[PDB]
């Protein structure tokens, strides 16, 4: 029920719908500008990125990292927890089917109250556009106002 702004590159800039995850209150409230990274392994973030020696920590003076993550195989909350542990500043979950947006919900059966990073589900189309812009060498910048 919210949106987001891809600010770069020109080929895909614009305002896109998205569905904010229904878990965690972001610690540093306000507006967040990031650079989008699509991981080369563990793209569904159901296992820890440490096992892969993969980190999304940004170097001093560079944009915080927004990790693009594919839907599948594990709970949304676990993906947010795993990506948070790898140091992403936010998580975008590309939907697996082309369909209207759904709201990522919490499960029940805990780390849940320890999830802090902004989370959102985007459409498969925007997910595919971002990946193709990145594949072609353009960094994909993005701003979140939630």
């Amino acid at each position: 029920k919210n949106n987001l702004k891809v600010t770069s590159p020109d080929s895909i800039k614009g305002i896109y719908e998205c569905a904010i995850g229904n878990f965690g209150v972001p610690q540093y409230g306000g507006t967040l500008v990031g650079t989008v990274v699509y991981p080369k392994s563990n793209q569904k973030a159901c296992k820890s990125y440490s096992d892969f020696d993969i980190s999304f920590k940004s170097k001093p003076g560079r944009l915080p990292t927004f990790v693009l993550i594919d839907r599948g195989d594990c709970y949304f909350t676990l993906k947010a927890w795993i990506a948070q542990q790898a140091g992403a500043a936010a998580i975008l979950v590309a939907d697996s089917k082309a369909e209207p947006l759904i709201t990522m919900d919490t499960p029940e059966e805990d780390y849940l109250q320890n999830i802090t990073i902004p989370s959102a589900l985007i459409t498969k189309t925007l997910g595919d556009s971002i990946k193709s812009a990145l594949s072609g060498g353009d960094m994909v910048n993005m701003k979140l106002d939630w």
Binding site: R71, G72, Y75, F76, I102, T103, M104, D105, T106, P107
Partner: peptide
């Protein structure tokens, strides 16, 4: 809708 996964 909503979902957990």
């Amino acid at each position: 809708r909503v979902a957990a996964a």
